[PDB]
C-alpha cells in the first residue's frame, strides 16, 4: 500500500556526499560509447568463466592451500627484508628469532591483544601453534589469518615475545604499455545493490540509476549484486509469485534495455546475496542468453571478485563486504589518531588476496580450492572498488584509489553510487601518476 514511500520523497537527490582528485562541476559526462573502449578481463587464468568444477572439498587440500598462502608470501617477504632464515615456532632459543606464520585466534570469539597466536607454516614448523606476547610491541596491526613475519624472543618455545612486526609488502602496480597512454578520457560509473527498498519490490532506485546512467552517458557501468537480495524480506519468506530465476532476468532486462541509447558498456558483478546464483565465493559470472547481437557488444559478465582492465586501467572488483569483515576482527596499538579503514585496506593490498581474512565471516562460504587460483590480486590495483555497508569514501592508499560507493540503497532510504574519471598521463617522471584522476560519491 505504501512501498518506497520514503525513498521517493527524498530531497537529497543528486547530492554529492564526497569528492576526490580535482574538483569537478556537476556536469559529469563521458562520450557515451564513442571512441575506443578496451574492456579486458584480467588476473590468473582468465578469472573463471564456467559455473565451477565442483562443490566438494578435500581437507587434505585446504590444508595444502593455507600453507602455500603463508609460504609464498613468506618466500617473498624473506627476499624483500632479506632475512636469513625463519626459526621453527617450536624451537626454543635465547637469541632473537624471526618466525613465519599466520595469526589466528585461540578461541571462537573476537581476536584480542591477549589471545593472539601464530600458526607457523608446514615447511618449517610443521604447523605448530605458539601464542604471542605483544606487551613489548609498539606499532602493530593484526587480523586473523594475517600472514606475518615476526621477530621476538621465544626461549621456552612456548611463547614468543614479539619485538618487531614486519610491515606488509604489496605487489608492483601494472606496467603501462605505450598503447595504454594513447587512450582518451573515460568515465566509469559504479554501483552495487540492494537495488530496491527493503519494504517494496519496486526497484525504484534501479530505475533512477538507469535514468542517471542515460543522462550522464557513462563509458562503463559496473554493477554489483545483489540484484535479487537473498535477504530482502519478501524473498526470504518466499511470498513472491514469481520464480527467482525470472525475477532476476527481469531486472537484467530493464537495465540492459533501459540503457540501450546510452552506449555504455555494462559489466555485472554477482553477489553471494543474489538468491538465484551459486552461493560460493569465488562466484562464476552470471548466466543469461537473452541478448541481441547488439547488446552482446554492450554487456559483459564477470566473476566475483575480479581484476578488470578499463583502458589499461586495472580495477579491482569484489562484491563481498571484505571491509566490514576484516574490520570487525582487527587489533591495533593505536586508537588516538589512525585511519581504521586506511589500515584494513592497507593489509588488503599487501595480503595479495580478495579475502585474506581466514577463517571467513560466519555467513560466507568459500571454496579454497578455487580461491587459490581465482581470488589473488595480479598487481596492486590502480583502483579498488570495495562496496560495503560502511559509509561512503575514497582514500588513496599505497598508490591505489580505494573506493567504496556505499550501497545504492539502504533499508528504507536513499543510497549512493559513484563515478570516476580516468586517463593515464605522460610516461616519465616520479613513476606513480595515478591514472584515476578524480572521483565522486553521489546520492541518488
Amino acid at each position: 500500500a505504501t512501498p518506497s514511500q520514503k525513498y521517493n520523497s527524498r530531497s537529497n537527490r543528486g547530492e554529492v556526499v564526497t569528492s576526490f582528485g580535482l574538483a569537478q562541476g556537476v556536469s559529469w559526462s563521458g562520450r557515451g560509447g564513442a571512441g575506443n573502449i578496451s574492456l579486458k578481463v584480467l588476473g590468473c587464468p582468465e578469472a573463471l568463466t564456467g559455473s565451477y568444477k565442483s562443490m566438494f572439498q578435500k581437507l587434505p587440500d585446504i590444508r595444502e592451500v593455507l600453507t602455500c598462502k603463508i609460504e609464498e608470501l613468506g618466500s617473498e617477504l624473506k627476499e624483500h627484508y632479506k632475512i636469513e632464515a625463519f626459526t621453527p615456532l617450536l624451537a626454543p632459543a635465547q637469541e632473537p628469532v624471526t618466525l613465519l606464520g599466520q595469526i589466528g585466534c585461540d578461541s571462537n570469539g573476537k581476536l584480542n591483544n591477549k589471545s593472539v597466536i601464530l600458526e607457523g607454516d608446514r615447511e618449517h614448523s610443521s604447523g605448530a601453534q605458539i601464542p604471542v606476547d605483544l606487551s613489548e610491541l609498539k606499532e602493530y596491526s593484526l587480523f586473523p589469518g594475517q600472514v606475518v613475519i615476526m621477530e621476538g624472543i621465544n626461549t621456552t618455545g612456548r611463547k614468543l615475545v614479539a619485538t618487531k612486526l614486519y610491515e606488509g609488502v604489496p605487489l608492483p602496480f601494472y606496467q603501462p604499455t605505450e598503447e595504454d597512454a594513447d587512450f582518451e578520457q573515460s568515465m566509469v560509473l559504479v554501483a552495487c545493490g540492494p537495488y530496491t527498498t527493503s519494504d517494496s519490490i519496486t526497484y525504484d532506485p534501479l530505475l533512477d540509476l538507469i535514468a542517471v546512467i542515460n543522462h550522464d552517458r557513462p563509458d562503463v557501468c559496473i554493477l554489483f549484486g545483489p540484484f535479487l537480495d537473498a535477504k530482502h524480506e519478501q524473498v526470504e519468506n518466499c511470498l513472491l509469485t514469481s520464480p527467482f530465476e525470472d525475477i532476476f532476468k527481469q531486472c537484467l532486462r530493464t537495465i540492459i534495455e533501459g540503457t540501450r541509447s546510452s552506449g555504455s558498456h555494462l559489466v555485472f558483478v554477482p553477489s553471494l546475496r543474489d538468491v538465484h546464483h551459486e552461493p560460493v565465493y569465488p562466484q562464476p559470472p552470471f548466466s543469461y542468453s537473452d541478448l541481441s547481437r547488439e547488446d552482446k557488444k554492450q554487456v559483459q559478465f564477470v566473476s566475483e571478485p575480479c581484476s578488470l582492465s578499463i583502458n589499461g586501467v586495472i580495477f579491482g572488483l569484489t562484491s563481498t563486504d571484505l571491509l566490514f569483515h576484516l574490520g570487525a576482527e582487527e587489533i591495533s596499538s593505536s586508537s588516538g589518531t589512525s585511519d581504521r579503514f586506511s589500515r584494513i585496506l592497507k593489509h588488503i593490498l599487501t595480503q595479495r588476496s580478495y579475502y585474506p581474512l581466514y577463517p571467513p565471516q560466519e555467513d560466507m562460504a568459500i571454496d579454497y580450492e578455487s580461491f587459490y587460483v581465482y581470488a589473488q590480486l595480479p598487481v596492486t590495483p590502480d583502483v579498488l572498488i570495495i562496496p560495503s555497508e560502511l559509509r561512503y569514501f575514497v582514500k588513496d592508499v599505497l598508490g591505489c584509489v580505494c573506493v567504496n560507493p556505499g550501497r545504492l540503497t539502504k533499508g528504507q532510504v536513499g543510497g549512493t553510487f559513484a563515478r570516476l574519471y580516468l586517463r593515464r598521463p605522460a610516461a616519465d617522471g616520479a613513476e606513480r601518476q595515478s591514472p584515476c584522476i578524480a572521483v565522486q560519491v553521489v546520492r541518488i
Partner: protein, 118 residues
C-alpha cells in the same frame, strides 16, 4: 651455585654449609660459576657428557650465558682450543661426546612423555 643480581645469598650460608660437609662451592657472579664449571671440565676432562634435554635447551643456554658474561675460555667445554664461538652446537663440544638421555630414551623405550620427570 651463584645468585641473580637482585638477590643476596642468605646469611651464614657459607658457614651453614661448612657444617653439613657438602662440596658446594659458592660463586658470586654467574660469570664466576660459569668459569668454575669451564674449569672443572678442563681437568676432569670428560670424554662423554650425559645430561637431559641437552641438545634441546641446556647446551645452548650455557654456551650463551657464557658468551654473555664473557667467561674465560668457553673452548674448555671443548677439547680443541678455539677463538670464536658459532651460534654451531654439535661443533661446540668437539672431542667430547654428548649423551642426551632424552633422545636415547625415546629411541630406546616407549613412554607417555620424555620430560625428565616421566
Amino acid at each position: 651455585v651463584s645468585k641473580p643480581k637482585d638477590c643476596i645469598f642468605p646469611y651464614a650460608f657459607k658457614e651453614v654449609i661448612e657444617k653439613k660437609n657438602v662440596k658446594v662451592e659458592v660463586a658470586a657472579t654467574e660469570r664466576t660459576l660459569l668459569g668454575f664449571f669451564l674449569a672443572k671440565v678442563h681437568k676432569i676432562d670428560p670424554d662423554i657428557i650425559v645430561g637431559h634435554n641437552i641438545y634441546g635447551f641446556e647446551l645452548e643456554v650455557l654456551l650463551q650465558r657464557i658468551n654473555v658474561c664473557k667467561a674465560p675460555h668457553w673452548s674448555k667445554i671443548g677439547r680443541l682450543k678455539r677463538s670464536n664461538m658459532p651460534k654451531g652446537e654439535r661443533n661446540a663440544t668437539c672431542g667430547r661426546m654428548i649423551c642426551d638421555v632424552e633422545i636415547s630414551a625415546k629411541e630406546l623405550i616407549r613412554c607417555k612423555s620424555y620430560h625428565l620427570s616421566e
